[PDB]
């Protein structure tokens, strides 16, 4: 039994902001302590490229090693659905393992965002749930946050995007807060970054 | 050179329904075309057992073989945290590879269920979204459905369960329907099956 390879798309946030640096990540696990050297090759649309950085192998913690390589990407390339391929070679393995990823091809569809106040029954408990629904969007690259009066709240969790039946995606973000904060009528807002949005941004306020 | 072994827990839906057949699945990858024969042993709490079925080895794109073995389980056994152990033997490996799994243990915590009507803005569109939130539950095995006046609606989708920050889980289910249906005040209901619930069931109704 050999090693394994994962390939992570850039952070959705990073591709949508000029100032961020969108990167693709080749990740390699189960690396022979005996043979801990690893060859990374990178292909952007079949053409090989050489600007990838390689990260200090951290012990994967049971004689095995975790080896990560990072390629920066061009925003527009990734947006254009450029196909990114990482190839891993090692002494402890038959043919080098190859994985490709890409911004999934198809119709960009702007998401619609809806905010949902707590159930009448949550009012019982000292902490309540404010729900943000985001739906009808394609492709699934996306980023949701929460803030109130300019400031981020971060006691929120957001679900992974989901294939709806009309071929588009949706997900929800839930933000948990003290009953009080809401009873006041503080105004919270759900904010969404996605390509098919104008300026890649929208935000929707709450109650 | 080598093969590998994965062990998958039954489908959450299967354990919670009497009529379904909850199974555990030993999966074996990277199998020598030269030596493609594989011995499966099964242990439910140290005691070996013999009712497992074995699935036609399907080839793989890279020529290698994928071999799967399936054990049915007893709902109550799985619920009680019975430890299930698969042992795989093959010529192409020294000591047989062994994996154990078991229903994740921790405080079973009963879920609370909250239903949420569409946003005032959905009322624009001809179809609207009725949201069922289900949270604070552990373990994550769970099943959510929708029905109205006795009958299932199935134009719904449910999100995968999610680690909340208090170490418990939650998810949401979204049911999509024609504005009208809702404007009438048809009563819809979200129903949830989960162990930590009394009779493993609860349902919560929806709106004016």
CB contact under 8 Å between B157 and A162, yes or no, is yes
DSSP state of B17: -
Are B88 and B155 found together in one domain?
no
Q: Which residues in A lie closer than 8 A to residue B97 (C-beta atoms)? A: 1
Nearest residue on chain A to B162, judged by CA atoms?
A: A159
Chosen for mutation from A35, A99, A100, A116 (greatest number of chain B CBs closer than 10 Å) is A116
Which of A2, A118, A164 is opposite residue B2, by nearest beta carbon?
Answer: A2
CA distance, residue A164 to nearest chain B CA (Å): 7
- Which of A135, A157, A163 shows the shortest C-beta gap to B165? A157
A69 and A135 inside one domain: no
A1: helix, strand or coil: coil
Q: Are residues B61 and B127 in the same domain?
A: no
What was the resolution (in A) of this experimentally determined structure?
A: 3.1
Q: What is the sign, positive or negative, of the torsion defined by CA atoms of A45, A46, A48, A54?
A: positive
Which residue is listed with tokens 């949508």?
A16
Across the A:B interface, residue pairs with CB atoms under 8 Å apart total 75
Tell me the nearest-neighbour CA distance from A116 into chain B, angstroms: 6
Say if residue A16 is in the same domain as residue A43: yes
Choose the closest CB to B174 out of A95, A129, A170.
A170
Bond preceding residue A139 cis, omega within 30 of 0? yes
Q: Of B102, B124, B154, at which residue does a domain stop?
A: B102
Q: Are residues B59 and B126 in the same domain?
A: no
> Using a CB-CB distance cutoff of 8 angstroms, which residues of chain B are in contact with residue A170?
157, 174
Per DSSP, what are the bridge partners of residue B69? B26, B54
Which of B96, B144, B174 to mutate: most A Cβ within 10 Å? B174
Residues β-bridged to residue B133: B114, B172
**Residue A83 DSSP class:** -
> What secondary structure letter does DSSP report for B109?
B
**Chain A residues touching B114 at Cβ < 8 A:** 118-119, 121-122, 129
The tokens of B118 are what?
């569409």
Taking the C-alpha atoms of residue A17 and residue A10, their distance in angstroms, rounded to an integer, is 12
Q: Which two tokens stand for residue B185?
A: 């005040």
Which residues touch A181 (CB under 8 Å, ≥6 apart)? none
* DSSP string of A90-154, one letter each residue: -TTSSSPEEEEE----S--B--EEEEEPPPTTGGGSSEEEEEEEEEEEBSS--EEEEEETTEEE-
Helix (H, G, I), strand (E, B) or coil at B198: helix
Q: How far is B163 from chain A (nearest CA, A)?
A: 8
Answer for the pair B143, B192: CB distance below 8 angstroms, yes or no.
yes
Beta bridge partners of A79: none
Residue that terminates a domain, selected from B102, B130, B159: B102
Chain breaks in chain A (C to N over 2.5 A) after: none
CB contact under 8 A, A133 and B131: yes
The vertex-B186 CA angle with B181 and B191, nearest 5°, equals: 110
Query: Pick from B102, B132, B164: which residue ends a domain?
Result: B102
Q: In this structure, are A145 and A65 located in the same domain?
A: no
Number of domains in chain A: 2
CA dist., res. B1 & res. A192, Å (int): 47
In this structure, are A139 and A45 located in the same domain?
no
Gap between the Cα atoms of A38 and A40, Å rounded = 7
What are B26's strand-pairing partners?
B7, B69
Cβ atoms B157, A162 nearer than 8 A:
yes
Nearest chain B residue to A161, by CA: B159
User: Which residues in chain B are contacts of A94 at CB distance < 8 A?
Assistant: 1
Residues A75 and A114 in one domain: no
Interface contact B115-A115, CB threshold 8 A: no
- Considering the domain architecture, whether residues B122 and B58 belong to the same structural domain is answered as no
Name all contacts of A121-126 with Cβ < 8 Å and 24+ positions apart: A121/B114, A122/B114, A123/A179, A125/A179, A126/A178, A126/A179
Instruction: Provide the phi-psi class of B157: left if phi over 0, else alpha when psi is between -120 and 50, else beta.
Output: beta
For residues A110 and A148, membership in a common domain is answered with yes
Alpha helix segments (H runs only) across chain B:
12-16, 75-79, 179-184
The answer to whether residues A179 and A87 belong to one domain is no
Method by which this entry was solved = X-ray
What range does the domain containing B61 cover? 3-102
Q: Residue A131 maps to which CATH number?
A: 2.60.40.10
Contact state of A1 with B97 under an 8 Å Cβ cutoff = yes
Check whether residue B142 and residue B176 sit in a common domain: yes
Q: Which of A172, A189, A206 to mutate to test the interface with B (most CBs of B within 10 A)?
A: A172
């Amino acid at each position: 039994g050999g090693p394994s390879v994962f390939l992570f798309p850039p952070k959705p946030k990073d591709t949508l902001m000029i100032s961020r640096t969108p990167e693709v990540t080749c990740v390699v696990v189960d690396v022979s302590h005996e043979d801990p050297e690893v060859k990374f090759n990178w292909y952007v649309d079949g053409v090989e490229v050489h600007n990838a950085k390689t990260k200090p192998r951290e012990e994967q913690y049971n004689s095995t090693y975790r080896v990560v390589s990072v390629l920066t990407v061009l925003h527009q390339d990734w947006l254009n659905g450029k196909e990114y391929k990482c190839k891993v070679s090692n002494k402890a393995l038959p043919a080098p393992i190859e994985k490709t990823i890409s911004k999934a091809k198809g119709q960009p569809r702007e998401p619609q965002v809806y905010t949902l106040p707590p159930s009448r029954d949550e009012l019982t408990k000292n902490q309540v749930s404010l729900t943000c629904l985001v739906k009808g969007f394609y492709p699934s690259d996306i980023a949701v946050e929460w803030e109130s009066n300019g400031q981020p709240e971060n006691n929120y969790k957001t679900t992974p995007p989901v294939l709806d039946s009309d071929g588009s995606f949706f997900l929800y973000s839930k933000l948990t807060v003290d009953k009080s904060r809401w009873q006041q009528g503080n105004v919270f807002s759900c904010s969404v970054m996605h390509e098919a949005l104008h300026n890649h941004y929208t935000q929707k306020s709450l109650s």
